[PDB]
Design a protein around this motif. Structure first.
Motif, PDB file in Angstrom:
ATOM      1  N   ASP A 184       1.205  -1.510   0.426  1.00  0.00           N
ATOM      2  CA  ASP A 184      -0.556  -0.150   0.304  1.00  0.00           C
ATOM      3  C   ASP A 184       0.713   1.604  -0.059  1.00  0.00           C
ATOM      4  OD1 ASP A 184      -2.538   0.481  -0.252  1.00  0.00           O
ATOM      5  OD2 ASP A 184      -2.853   1.825   1.800  1.00  0.00           O
ATOM      6  N   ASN A 185       1.948   0.973  -0.764  1.00  0.00           N
ATOM      7  CA  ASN A 185       2.290   2.549  -1.621  1.00  0.00           C
ATOM      8  C   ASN A 185       2.806   2.791  -2.256  1.00  0.00           C
ATOM      9  OD1 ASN A 185       4.245   0.475  -2.457  1.00  0.00           O
ATOM     10  ND2 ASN A 185       5.498   0.271  -0.478  1.00  0.00           N
ATOM     11  N   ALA A 186       3.362   4.015  -2.840  1.00  0.00           N
ATOM     12  CA  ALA A 186       3.686   4.678  -4.299  1.00  0.00           C
ATOM     13  C   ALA A 186       5.050   4.065  -5.577  1.00  0.00           C
ATOM     14  CB  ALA A 186       4.070   6.250  -3.718  1.00  0.00           C
ATOM     15  N   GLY A 187       5.521   2.778  -4.828  1.00  0.00           N
ATOM     16  CA  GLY A 187       6.473   1.579  -4.918  1.00  0.00           C
ATOM     17  C   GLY A 187       5.433   1.102  -5.810  1.00  0.00           C
ATOM     18  N   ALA A 188       4.660   0.598  -5.322  1.00  0.00           N
ATOM     19  CA  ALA A 188       3.994  -0.641  -5.666  1.00  0.00           C
ATOM     20  C   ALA A 188       2.881  -0.154  -6.916  1.00  0.00           C
ATOM     21  CB  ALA A 188       2.912  -2.078  -4.195  1.00  0.00           C
ATOM     22  N   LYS A 189       2.234   1.143  -6.426  1.00  0.00           N
ATOM     23  CA  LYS A 189       1.231   1.806  -7.224  1.00  0.00           C
ATOM     24  C   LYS A 189       1.875   1.297  -8.686  1.00  0.00           C
ATOM     25  CE  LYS A 189       1.124   6.241  -5.913  1.00  0.00           C
ATOM     26  NZ  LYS A 189       0.562   6.932  -6.603  1.00  0.00           N
ATOM     27  N   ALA A 346      -6.239  -7.672  -8.864  1.00  0.00           N
ATOM     28  CA  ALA A 346      -5.326  -6.595  -9.230  1.00  0.00           C
ATOM     29  C   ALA A 346      -5.090  -6.754 -10.250  1.00  0.00           C
ATOM     30  CB  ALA A 346      -3.913  -6.842  -8.192  1.00  0.00           C
ATOM     31  N   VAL A 347      -4.128  -7.003 -11.187  1.00  0.00           N
ATOM     32  CA  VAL A 347      -4.178  -7.309 -12.107  1.00  0.00           C
ATOM     33  C   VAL A 347      -5.680  -7.905 -13.628  1.00  0.00           C
ATOM     34  CG1 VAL A 347      -2.542  -8.435 -14.301  1.00  0.00           C
ATOM     35  CG2 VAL A 347      -1.870  -8.160 -11.571  1.00  0.00           C
ATOM     36  N   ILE A 348      -5.899  -9.261 -13.319  1.00  0.00           N
ATOM     37  CA  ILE A 348      -7.154  -9.957 -14.140  1.00  0.00           C
ATOM     38  C   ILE A 348      -8.042  -8.773 -14.122  1.00  0.00           C
ATOM     39  CG2 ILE A 348      -8.164 -11.899 -14.619  1.00  0.00           C
ATOM     40  CD1 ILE A 348      -5.169 -12.017 -14.015  1.00  0.00           C
ATOM     41  N   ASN A 349      -9.003  -9.049 -13.000  1.00  0.00           N
ATOM     42  CA  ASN A 349      -9.874  -7.837 -12.759  1.00  0.00           C
ATOM     43  C   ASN A 349      -9.608  -6.737 -12.458  1.00  0.00           C
ATOM     44  OD1 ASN A 349     -11.402  -9.983 -10.667  1.00  0.00           O
ATOM     45  ND2 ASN A 349     -13.143  -7.964 -10.644  1.00  0.00           N
ATOM     46  N   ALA A 351      -8.080  -5.427 -15.456  1.00  0.00           N
ATOM     47  CA  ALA A 351      -7.363  -5.351 -16.740  1.00  0.00           C
ATOM     48  C   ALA A 351      -8.531  -6.160 -17.342  1.00  0.00           C
ATOM     49  CB  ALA A 351      -6.618  -6.669 -17.206  1.00  0.00           C
ATOM     50  N   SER A 352     -10.133  -5.945 -16.646  1.00  0.00           N
ATOM     51  CA  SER A 352     -11.119  -6.581 -17.418  1.00  0.00           C
ATOM     52  C   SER A 352     -11.545  -5.318 -17.712  1.00  0.00           C
ATOM     53  CB  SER A 352     -11.888  -7.082 -16.432  1.00  0.00           C
ATOM     54  OG  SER A 352     -11.425  -8.153 -15.236  1.00  0.00           O
ATOM     55  N   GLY A 353     -12.325  -4.451 -17.019  1.00  0.00           N
ATOM     56  CA  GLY A 353     -12.577  -2.883 -17.202  1.00  0.00           C
ATOM     57  C   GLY A 353     -13.368  -2.497 -16.351  1.00  0.00           C
ATOM     58  N   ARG A 354     -13.487  -3.050 -15.691  1.00  0.00           N
ATOM     59  CA  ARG A 354     -14.921  -2.370 -13.826  1.00  0.00           C
ATOM     60  C   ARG A 354     -14.125  -2.656 -13.146  1.00  0.00           C
ATOM     61  NH1 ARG A 354     -18.730  -5.690 -16.093  1.00  0.00           N
ATOM     62  NH2 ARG A 354     -20.458  -5.208 -16.119  1.00  0.00           N
ATOM     63  N   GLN A 355     -12.496  -2.118 -12.964  1.00  0.00           N
ATOM     64  CA  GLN A 355     -11.784  -2.846 -11.682  1.00  0.00           C
ATOM     65  C   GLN A 355     -10.923  -1.802 -12.432  1.00  0.00           C
ATOM     66  OE1 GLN A 355     -10.321  -5.455  -9.151  1.00  0.00           O
ATOM     67  NE2 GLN A 355     -11.317  -4.068  -8.788  1.00  0.00           N
ATOM     68  N   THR A 356     -10.048  -0.468 -10.852  1.00  0.00           N
ATOM     69  CA  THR A 356      -9.404   0.282 -10.815  1.00  0.00           C
ATOM     70  C   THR A 356      -8.387   0.059  -9.829  1.00  0.00           C
ATOM     71  OG1 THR A 356      -9.507   2.853 -10.231  1.00  0.00           O
ATOM     72  CG2 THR A 356     -10.525   1.824  -9.099  1.00  0.00           C
ATOM     73  N   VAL A 357      -7.066   0.353 -10.436  1.00  0.00           N
ATOM     74  CA  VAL A 357      -6.166  -0.457  -9.688  1.00  0.00           C
ATOM     75  C   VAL A 357      -6.412   0.417  -8.178  1.00  0.00           C
ATOM     76  CG1 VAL A 357      -4.400  -0.650 -11.122  1.00  0.00           C
ATOM     77  CG2 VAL A 357      -5.294   1.967 -10.510  1.00  0.00           C
ATOM     78  N   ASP A 358      -6.952   1.349  -8.581  1.00  0.00           N
ATOM     79  CA  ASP A 358      -7.007   2.244  -6.723  1.00  0.00           C
ATOM     80  C   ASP A 358      -8.345   1.763  -6.021  1.00  0.00           C
ATOM     81  OD1 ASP A 358      -6.824   4.578  -9.168  1.00  0.00           O
ATOM     82  OD2 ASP A 358      -6.616   5.303  -7.803  1.00  0.00           O
ATOM     83  N   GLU A 359      -8.892   1.010  -6.047  1.00  0.00           N
ATOM     84  CA  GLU A 359      -9.860   0.381  -5.444  1.00  0.00           C
ATOM     85  C   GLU A 359      -9.104  -1.087  -5.169  1.00  0.00           C
ATOM     86  OE1 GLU A 359     -13.923   0.711  -4.111  1.00  0.00           O
ATOM     87  OE2 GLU A 359     -12.850   0.179  -2.638  1.00  0.00           O
ATOM     88  N   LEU A 361      -6.471  -2.675  -5.989  1.00  0.00           N
ATOM     89  CA  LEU A 361      -4.650  -2.864  -5.142  1.00  0.00           C
ATOM     90  C   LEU A 361      -4.732  -2.356  -3.747  1.00  0.00           C
ATOM     91  CD1 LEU A 361      -1.721  -2.300  -4.247  1.00  0.00           C
ATOM     92  CD2 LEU A 361      -2.253  -3.610  -6.262  1.00  0.00           C
ATOM     93  N   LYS A 362      -5.319  -0.977  -3.437  1.00  0.00           N
ATOM     94  CA  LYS A 362      -5.206   0.200  -2.105  1.00  0.00           C
ATOM     95  C   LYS A 362      -6.460  -1.351  -0.919  1.00  0.00           C
ATOM     96  CE  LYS A 362      -5.696   3.977  -1.009  1.00  0.00           C
ATOM     97  NZ  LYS A 362      -5.923   4.542   0.270  1.00  0.00           N
TER      98      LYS A 362
END
Length: 370
Positions: A184-189, A346-349, A351-359, A361-362
């Motif tokens: 949950d940091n800037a490096g992983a994001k 994170a990647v699959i969901n 990459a689908s089109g209804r999943q933001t890295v914000d919600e 991954l975080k």
């Protein structure tokens, strides 16, 4: 108090067909030394089942993570050191193979990967990673590619997002904290965001499969193939030269991939400790048996400064030695297995089109902990 005159070996990646073949018969030849050569494959799951009996045989080689870390609770006896330690042992090797101040495991096999490079069909500054992706412009510009590999596997994305500064779990000395995660940091994001641009800027849809990507690695005619000592399909005495180099840096810091050492050990019910230490110390620890398994044919580097000193000829221990110095040791926590549920969402969901890295991954971080 019972004694015996037989021991069963267990190897899963040592190979040594002719090597162990001789050493095994040479001993009994004296008048009382018979060793059973056995190798596992799926016994990994039977272990907890066949273990409840008390572990039949008593000779097996496996990585240190699931050997000296798991056996410490099951039934594994500690090992006694000799003069080879005081002589000149790599402190970076044993200092990490300790658990609760006890040495219940010894490394005798290095498993890891190299970065493949093409003979001379890729001119560029290997100082920057970004120089690789651009190679597609000149490569594709004709009718080829300078790099080809998977995209949704834990062998590329992870090692790519690691060269940013994204930690997995808090591991100090030999234990974890409780809820200390460095995701949950800037490096992983920033790392998960860059990986997405690569797939869109390359495939623009992500339609690469195993049989599709396998075509490249199969003919290694592109400056991008990742392989290890235990991932080669069909030996065959080929006649093509291949380049093995270690990964560069990213943004200013390298990535943390997998390093592996095989720890040897016997069940906490081995007969005759003095007889075991003597038999094993001269079995797989001398020019008698060693040369058999590591001299019949070179493949894995040993934890010996004297041997590796001549080893300058073999590029296995040398090339991997680069990442080893600046690499991370595999995990040994059961909670880490939960991450599998993260990478998929994170990647699959996303990459689908209804999943933001914000919600994706975080929020995924807070979910794993609670």
């Amino acid at each position: 108090k019972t004694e015996e005159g037989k021991l069963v070996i267990w190897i899963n990646g040592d190979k040594g067909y002719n090597g162990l073949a001789e050493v095994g018969k040479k001993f009994e030849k004296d008048t009382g030394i018979k060793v059973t050569v056995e190798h596992p494959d799926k016994l990994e799951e039977k272990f907890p089942q066949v273990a409840a009996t008390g572990d039949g045989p008593d000779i097996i080689f496996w990585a240190h993570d699931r050997f000296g870390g798991y056996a410490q609770s099951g039934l594994l006896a500690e090992i006694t050191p000799d003069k080879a330690f005081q002589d000149k042992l790599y402190p970076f090797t044993w200092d990490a193979v300790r658990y609760n101040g006890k040495l219940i495991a010894y490394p005798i096999a290095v498993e890891a990967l190299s970065l493949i490079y093409n003979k001379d069909l890729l001119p560029n500054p290997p100082k920057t990673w970004e120089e690789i992706p651009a190679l597609d412009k000149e490569l594709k510009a004709k009718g080829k590619s300078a790099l080809m590999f998977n995209l949704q596997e834990p062998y590329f994305t992870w090692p790519l997002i690691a060269a940013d500064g994204g930690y997995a779990f808090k591991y100090e000395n030999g234990k974890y904290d409780i809820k200390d995660v460095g995701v949950d940091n800037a490096g992983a994001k920033a790392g998960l965001t860059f990986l997405v641009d690569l797939i869109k800027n390359k495939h623009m849809n992500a339609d690469t499969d195993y049989s599709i990507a396998e075509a490249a690695f199969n003919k290694g005619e592109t400056a991008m193939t990742i392989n290890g000592p235990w991932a080669w399909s069909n030996i065959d005495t080929s006649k093509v030269n291949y380049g093995v180099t270690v990964l560069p840096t990213f943004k200013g810091q390298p990535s943390k991939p997998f390093v592996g050492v095989l720890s040897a050990g016997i069940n906490a019910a081995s007969p005759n400790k003095e007889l075991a230490k003597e038999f094993l110390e001269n079995y797989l620890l001398t020019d008698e048996g060693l040369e058999a398994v590591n001299k019949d044919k070179p493949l894995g580097a040993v934890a010996l400064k004297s041997y590796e000193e001549e080893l300058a000829k073999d590029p296995r221990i040398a090339a991997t030695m680069e990442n080893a110095q600046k690499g991370e040791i595999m995990p040994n926590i059961p909670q880490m297995s939960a991450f599998w549920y993260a990478v998929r969402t994170a990647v699959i969901n996303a990459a689908s089109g209804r999943q933001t890295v914000d919600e994706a991954l975080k929020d995924a971080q807070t979910r794993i902990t609670k």
